[PDB]
Design an enzyme around this catalytic site. Structure first.
Site, PDB file in Angstrom:
ATOM      1  N   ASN A  27      -4.411   9.104 -13.127  1.00  0.00           N
ATOM      2  CA  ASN A  27      -3.049   9.434 -12.300  1.00  0.00           C
ATOM      3  C   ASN A  27      -2.476  10.162 -12.661  1.00  0.00           C
ATOM      4  OD1 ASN A  27      -0.872   8.838 -11.174  1.00  0.00           O
ATOM      5  ND2 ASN A  27      -0.182   7.925 -12.572  1.00  0.00           N
TER       6      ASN A  27
ATOM      7  N   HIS B 202       1.281  11.504 -13.891  1.00  0.00           N
ATOM      8  CA  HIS B 202       2.380  11.373 -13.772  1.00  0.00           C
ATOM      9  C   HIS B 202       3.558  12.347 -14.063  1.00  0.00           C
ATOM     10  CE1 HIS B 202       5.540   8.268 -13.592  1.00  0.00           C
ATOM     11  NE2 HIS B 202       5.892   8.579 -15.040  1.00  0.00           N
TER      12      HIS B 202
ATOM     13  N   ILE C 238      -2.500   0.767  -6.797  1.00  0.00           N
ATOM     14  CA  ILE C 238      -4.004   0.131  -6.830  1.00  0.00           C
ATOM     15  C   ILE C 238      -4.726  -1.478  -6.935  1.00  0.00           C
ATOM     16  CG2 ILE C 238      -6.067   1.023  -7.012  1.00  0.00           C
ATOM     17  CD1 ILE C 238      -4.864   4.101  -7.398  1.00  0.00           C
TER      18      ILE C 238
END
Ligand SMILES: Nc1nc2c(c(=O)[nH]1)N[C@H](CN(C=O)c1ccc(C(=O)N[C@@H](CCC(=O)O)C(=O)O)cc1)CN2
Length: 193
Positions: free
Chosen positions: A71, A73, A57
């Protein structure tokens, strides 16, 4: 906060997650391709959730969405930033687990919101450990989203330490994965020292 918002989900379409988010009365859109900072996909977006999004991004997007972009992860950060975290957690015998973090300009380097350790068992395979991480981070997200949705966990600096891998780093170890996803992890532990 509390105002109905617009959430952009980056990554594969997941109807269950769209539906979950919409049960809080937010509107949801999804996107899986690259994003220029001028993309109209970003207009009027209040919050970004990336979960399996395949691109970096852009930093101007990161700055525009400071404290509004997270995010999901499937590693215990700071270990196993980047690619194939489940495999590398066995190859390098590192901590294992899942992490929700703020997105910053680097890859998987942003501030940590919540994490969870995920243990494994004697006869696990890469498939069974990957599936357990996937279920655990989706659980952790839904458990904490009522708080995250209202700005209630500002996150902490990501501890210095850990590890990072690119997709190509696993090539010299693929010979260990004789049964693909169904390779027992016991065969893999420590093989990258
Ligand atoms: N700025 C930013 N973008 C983000 C994340 C982040 O924390 N920060 N999290 C996700 C990170 N991610 C997936 O979730 C993701 C996607 C693509 C590549 C990528 O482009 N990998 C190549 C080269 C990478 C490099 O050179 O540094 C590779 O593995 O070889 C890496 C990570 C999604 N986008």
């Amino acid at each position: 906060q509390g105002a109905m918002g617009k959430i952009l989900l980056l990554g594969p379409e997941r109807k269950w997650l769209r539906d979950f988010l919409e049960s809080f009365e937010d509107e949801v859109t999804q996107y899986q391709d690259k994003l220029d900072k001028k993309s109209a996909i970003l207009n009027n977006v209040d919050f970004i959730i990336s979960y399996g999004y395949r691109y970096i991004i852009h930093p101007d997007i990161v700055e525009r969405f400071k404290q509004r972009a997270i995010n999901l992860h499937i590693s215990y950060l700071p270990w196993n930033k980047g690619a194939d975290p489940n495999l590398w957690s066995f190859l390098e015998d590192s901590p294992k687990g899942v992490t929700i973090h703020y997105i910053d300009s680097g890859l998987d380097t942003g501030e940590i919101i919540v994490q969870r350790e995920v243990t494994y068992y004697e006869n696990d395979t890469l498939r069974t450990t990957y599936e357990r991480l996937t279920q655990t981070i989706e659980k952790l997200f839904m458990e904490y989203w009522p708080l995250i949705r209202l700005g209630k966990i500002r996150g902490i600096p990501q501890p210095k330490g850990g590890s990072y891998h690119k997709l190509k780093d696993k090539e010299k170890y693929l010979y260990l994965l004789t049964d693909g996803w169904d390779t027992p992890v016991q065969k893999l532990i420590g093989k990258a020292q």
